Design a protein around this ligand. Sequence first.
Ligand SMILES: CC(=O)N[C@@H]1[C@@H](O)[C@H](O)[C@@H](CO)O[C@@H]1O
Ligand SMILES: [Cl-]
Ligand SMILES: [Cl-]
Ligand SMILES: [Cl-]
Ligand SMILES: [Cl-]
Ligand SMILES: [Cl-]
Ligand code: NA
Length: 129
Amino acid sequence: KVFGRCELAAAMKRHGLDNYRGYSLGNWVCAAKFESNFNTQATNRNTDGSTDYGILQINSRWWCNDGRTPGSRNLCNIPCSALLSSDITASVNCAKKIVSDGNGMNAWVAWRNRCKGTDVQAWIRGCRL
Ligand SMILES: CC(=O)N[C@@H]1[C@@H](O)[C@H](O)[C@@H](CO)O[C@@H]1O
Ligand SMILES: [Cl-]
Ligand SMILES: [Cl-]
Ligand SMILES: [Cl-]
Ligand SMILES: [Cl-]
Ligand SMILES: [Cl-]
Ligand code: NA
């Protein structure tokens, strides 16, 4: 499923991401846009042989099981396929664990490079939240 911007801001808000660990909603929407283009079906293979899955490109090295990343962890206790669902619950719950893990939203390369220190409120401007 490819979300509209405001559609994803609202879903993310429903699911408890707004100001989660002090990260305003625009931070999450911005990170989704540059990680996945708001496409829940996005998959990308990494040089280390891990894969990034879903709307927030969560990595099979640490966070989910895809049965093809030797010596990896599954710290969100889910099949990586769970993160490709049109329902973002699984992605959001895993994201909450990731942003709680010490480094905050810097775990998302696209967030660090494209959203951090920007006017991220512009990503929720004019949305019914
Ligand atoms: C939270 C999370 O798993 N982030 C991943 C990161 O590990 C990976 O290096 C990057 C590749 O572009 O995609 C995502 O940002
Ligand atoms: Cl957009
Ligand atoms: Cl594996
Ligand atoms: Cl949803
Ligand atoms: Cl933080
Ligand atoms: Cl915001
Ligand atoms: Na894994």
